Amino acid sequence: ELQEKLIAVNRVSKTVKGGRIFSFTALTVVGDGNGRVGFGYGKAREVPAAIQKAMEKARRNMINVALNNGTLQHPVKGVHTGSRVFMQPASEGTGIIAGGAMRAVLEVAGVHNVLAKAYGSTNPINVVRATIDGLENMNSPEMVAAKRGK
Amino acid sequence: MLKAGVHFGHQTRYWNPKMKPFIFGARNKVHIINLEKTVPMFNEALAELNKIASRKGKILFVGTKRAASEAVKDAALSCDQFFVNHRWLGGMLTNWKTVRQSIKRLKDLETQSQDGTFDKLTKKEALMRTRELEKLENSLGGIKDMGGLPDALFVIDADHEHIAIKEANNLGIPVFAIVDTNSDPDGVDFVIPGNDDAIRAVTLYLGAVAATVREGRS
Amino acid sequence: IKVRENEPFDVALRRFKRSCEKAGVLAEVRRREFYEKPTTERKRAKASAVK
RNA sequence: ACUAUGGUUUUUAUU
RNA sequence: CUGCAUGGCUGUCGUCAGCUCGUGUUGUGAAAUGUUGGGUUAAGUCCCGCAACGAGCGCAACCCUUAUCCUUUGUUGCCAG
RNA sequence: AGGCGGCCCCCUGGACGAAGACUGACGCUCAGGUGCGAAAGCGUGGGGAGCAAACAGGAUUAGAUACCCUGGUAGUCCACGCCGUAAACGAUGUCGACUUGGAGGUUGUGCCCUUGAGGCGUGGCUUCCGGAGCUAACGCGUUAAGUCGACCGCCUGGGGA
């Protein structure tokens, strides 16, 4: 059930001998709509080929989580450099909310409502990979029974 | 008496305090290893390696120094195993899909040097072929037939071949190693007390598990 | 023991090996810890002879 | 050894 | 009229040995590593060593031109008994 | 902190540790308050060898107001005083506490089956690498830029200031 999302795509400029050269770069995520997402970055000549190089990175590793009520099992924190992400679980099917640099990473994994926020610097690659670090921060079940609840 | 012929002991500032479960006490201020549980601990790990051999799983040996290379390069020719001869190429297993280009070239030079025309011009056609062969065998001369990743890795020089663990433990592969009183095990899964000095007992030990891999009927 | 001659003297005797600028005082100071850390590769002493 | 000086502006991003 | 609408055509270093990809690694990334470092060479040609391994374009060779000998070709050219 | 060296004597500040002794939270920080210059300068009075701003003489040169070079005042020195100056920049305010290794030196303090021409614990100082973690990055790295309490100042474009 493979699904892909483009988050951002732009051109870049670079210095060479006595001048400059232009190229394309993309930021993407890929997931299964039910438990996993992977993140990709990529640069190339021609824009579709840059996007495709990012999709191949998003397939190089995926993070697999146990989503609960189409939302988070518990609150989570994710960090990459200056970009800090925090997420509170959402109630009543509503609460979405959050910009594409958080939302796109979760709408590809099967999340329907989530109260995500980003803090610090807003480079979207760092925010997306901090959202992925927050998905490495979530735990699985509802099995260990060590707390009364809830 | 395991020979283990370095066991005496020596050097009070040699051991690692992490090694206590492998230690047999102290003797003349030197902490000494237990050499009477070596085979009991090896047999306990043999059961886990033998689960791989009984399925003909791809097993990789390290024999990367010349006096140990001569105890695997043709001594194991009936065991259908794979080995590292010298180089690790900085990423031989984390980039195997690219190393494949020079495996194909190594086989292209084997098929050229086994061709009937290889007797013609023993310098003017042979030299440029045998030169690249002497390079590629030092890299890949024991792994040419492996066709993919290891199921387990076995090493007898993990005191210096740290790249073996850096590749294996990045790929999730269990490592089988020997340990000495100064060892620092973290990325290795199966450890047996002995010595990593000399060649005889470490190559005879490698040859004793080569039989475990041959009992997998290949 | 480079010069050591007193009283009569002839020719140059200014250009010598060992002590003053390399082997093993002065010069090479940008190498810093190379004067201590390499131990038995660069330092013979150890006691029992000439401290 | 001595041997100074040169205005402002003036390029590449495709659907 | 328009080399500040555009093609087609065009200087020169120098015929210098360098320009540029895929995968891995490394970095927050542009990128870097690679191709750098040691020698040999006309040469990124080879050798040494190797967190890089390989590759396209250039280098080489091809083509082309000159000496020696054999074989081949001879009029309106050549000549030893 | 700035700094402080030369040789001898008298006087004299502060640091650091082990087993015990003593008060019994007596402690920590601190607006204001009271204190402290490497230099240059000024102020009252001396002193002038060495060196030298300024200025002269001669060169080099387009010119040379610089270097070279013949001189030379102030200043440097001293009994001192005033100021609070700076890259006062080893950019780390002051206190408290937890954590990972190594190579090396010193100073206490306690040990050693000391066949050592010495060795090992454990405090203080302390150089340089190095693991976690923090920072954009350098790197910091148990003497932290990690972690986290107490107190007092400072920050929120540059030109203009």
From Swiss-Prot, chain A:
Q: Name one GO cellular component term.
A: cytosol
Q: What Pfam families does the record point to?
A: Ribosomal_S5, Ribosomal_S5_C
Enumerate the transmembrane spans: none
A GO biological process of this protein is: maintenance of translational fidelity
Q: Start and end of every S5 DRBM domain?
A: 2-65
What molecular functions are annotated in GO for this chain? rRNA binding; structural constituent of ribosome
Q: Which keywords label this protein?
A: Acetylation, Antibiotic resistance, Ribonucleoprotein, Ribosomal protein, RNA-binding, rRNA-binding
Quaternary structure and interacting proteins, as annotated = Part of the 30S ribosomal subunit. Contacts proteins uS4 and uS8. With proteins uS4 and uS5 encircles the mRNA as it enters the ribosome, which may play a role in mRNA helicase processivity. Can be cross-linked to mRNA. In collided ribosomes contacts ribosome rescue factor SmrB.
Q: What else is known?
A: Altered uS5 proteins have been identified in a number of mutants. Some mutations in uS5 have been shown to increase translational error frequencies. Some mutants in this protein can partially suppress an alanyl-tRNA synthetase mutant.
Q: Which family does it belong to?
A: Belongs to the universal ribosomal protein uS5 family.
Q: HAMAP family, alphabetically?
A: Ribosomal_uS5_B (MF_01307_B)
The protein, known as: Small ribosomal subunit protein uS5
Gene of this entry: rpsE
Swiss-Prot record, chain B:
What InterPro entries does the record tag this protein with? Ribosomal_uS2, Ribosomal_uS2_bac/mit/plastid, Ribosomal_uS2_CS, Ribosomal_uS2_flav_dom_sf
One of this protein's GO BP terms? Answer: ribosomal small subunit assembly
Q: Which gene encodes it?
A: rpsB
Task: Return one GO MF term.
Answer: structural constituent of ribosome
Give UniProt keywords alphabetically. Ribonucleoprotein, Ribosomal protein
Q: Would you tell me the protein name for this molecule?
A: Small ribosomal subunit protein uS2
UniProt source species: Escherichia coli (strain K12)
One GO term describing the cellular component: cytoplasm
Recorded coiled-coil stretches: none
The modified positions for N6-succinyllysine read K107
Q: How does it assemble?
A: Part of the 30S ribosomal subunit, contacts bS1. Some nascent polypeptide chains are able to cross-link to this protein in situ. In collided ribosomes contacts ribosome rescue factor SmrB.
PROSITE patterns linked to this entry: RIBOSOMAL_S2_1, RIBOSOMAL_S2_2
Keyword match ATP-binding: no
Q: Relate the protein's function as given in its record.
A: Required for ribosomal protein bS1 (rpsA) to bind to the 30S subunit.
To which protein family does this belong?
A: Belongs to the universal ribosomal protein uS2 family.
Swiss-Prot record, chain C:
Q: Where is the composition biased (Basic residues)?
A: 43-51
Q: Which GO terms describe its biological process?
A: cytoplasmic translation; ribosomal small subunit assembly
A GO molecular function annotation here is: structural constituent of ribosome
Q: Name one GO cellular component term.
A: cytoplasm
> Which key words tag this protein in UniProt?
Ribonucleoprotein, Ribosomal protein, RNA-binding, rRNA-binding
In terms of superkingdom, the source organism counts as Bacteria
Entry's family note: Belongs to the bacterial ribosomal protein bS21 family.
Q: What does this protein do?
A: Probbly involved in recognition of ribosome rescue factor SmrB in stalled/collided disomes; fusion of protein fragments to its N-terminus decreases ribosome rescue in the presence of SmrB.
Its quaternary organisation is:
Part of the 30S ribosomal subunit. In stalled ribosomes contacts ribosome rescue factor SmrB.
Name of the protein this chain belongs to: Small ribosomal subunit protein bS21
What is the protein's species of origin? Escherichia coli (strain K12)
